[PDB]
Design a protein around this ligand. Structure first.
Ligand SMILES: CC(=O)SCCNC(=O)CCNC(=O)[C@H](O)C(C)(C)COP(=O)(O)OP(=O)(O)OC[C@H]1O[C@@H](n2cnc3c(N)ncnc32)[C@H](O)[C@@H]1OP(=O)(O)O
Ligand SMILES: CC(=O)SCCNC(=O)CCNC(=O)[C@H](O)C(C)(C)COP(=O)(O)OP(=O)(O)OC[C@H]1O[C@@H](n2cnc3c(N)ncnc32)[C@H](O)[C@@H]1OP(=O)(O)O
Lengths: 137, 137
């Protein structure tokens, strides 16, 4: 079970993982050119776990020079409950802290009941009830 | 009324503007080293307006390779209602779009009644009622 940085050549394996994971919504930004630019901008910040040449978990992460933003946290069903998500999260947050990023955010759809439950259970995170988000249309 | 890119040398003027503007909360990340690293990561994406050698308006912006994030939108009280915030917004969004960033976010405190009113009035933005935000503690 090798934890390592995601690189551009991982795109087919990660896109396949995302595609087969209920609860992960694929969008335009998940396609190769966006992935390539993301990794060039955020090198070493996104992580995956592989075993026997297969990718079994991932966490995409990056920052804007002020805050961290994490996306597409996945552990394959066969490898859940082993602490892999927590392992990736601890490592991403450490790397972000090295780069001067002391606060990070995740966005979770209200309709994603299982994801909400996961994030409410992480004691190092808090659901924000003090802010509104406005986004471009 | 000259609109231009913010550079590192603008820190004293911008910090002074932020400091004298009710509704702008100053934090650690507003100090010079964070500002310097932010501008290196996001060159030309933050803007200011100056007239007669004085900075009268600003908008800080950046991105993580996936989404845009804007903050510290300010127009000096003597120059409000002249479209300066809209001018900066249009230009930042255009520059973000050139960089492949098609969706941007702002976080606005629930208690910030005037800022909420401003953002609700921008027809190119929408208040999100479909997501929860979790942040590191
Ligand atoms: C990425 C976003 O911003 S939202 C999208 C989140 N991802 C998904 O919804 C994809 C589908 N789900 C998954 O891939 C997995 O269920 C994950 C990644 C959420 C969790 O994977 P796991 O292997 O359970 O995580 P891990 O074992 O590291 O969990 C850390 C702790 O969180 C807690 N936890 C995990 N899942 C849940 C849950 N659904 N509800 C409450 N608490 C949970 C557990 O206490 C766990 O400790 P453990 O190791 O003793 O079980
Ligand atoms: C940065 C964030 O994410 S939140 C923090 C926002 N910033 C602040 O609260 C700092 C204090 N406030 C300010 O500096 C200013 O009042 C600003 C920047 C919010 C607005 O400055 P203004 O000079 O009004 O900007 P501008 O004229 O470009 O406003 C655009 C339009 O928004 C609307 N608008 C502006 N302020 C408000 C308001 N308080 N309520 C409702 N609508 C408004 C108007 O329709 C205005 O039309 P106009 O372009 O014809 O003038």
């Amino acid at each position: 079970m090798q934890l390592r940085s995601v690189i551009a050549a991982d795109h087919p394996a990660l896109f396949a993982l995302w595609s087969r994971t209920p609860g992960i919504r694929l969008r335009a930004e998940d396609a190769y050119p966006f992935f390539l630019a993301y990794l060039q901008r955020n090198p070493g910040l996104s992580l995956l776990v592989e075993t026997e040449g297969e990718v079994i978990a991932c966490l995409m992460a990056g920052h804007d020079g002020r805050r961290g933003y994490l996306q597409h946290l996945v552990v394959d069903p066969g490898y859940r409950g082993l602490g892999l998500a927590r392992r990736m999260l601890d490592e991403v947050l450490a790397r972000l802290a090295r780069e001067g990023i002391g606060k990070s955010h995740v966005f979770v759809l209200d309709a994603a009941e299982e994801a909400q439950a996961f994030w409410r259970a992480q004691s190092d995170w808090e659901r924000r009830k003090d802010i509104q988000v406005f986004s471009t249309r």
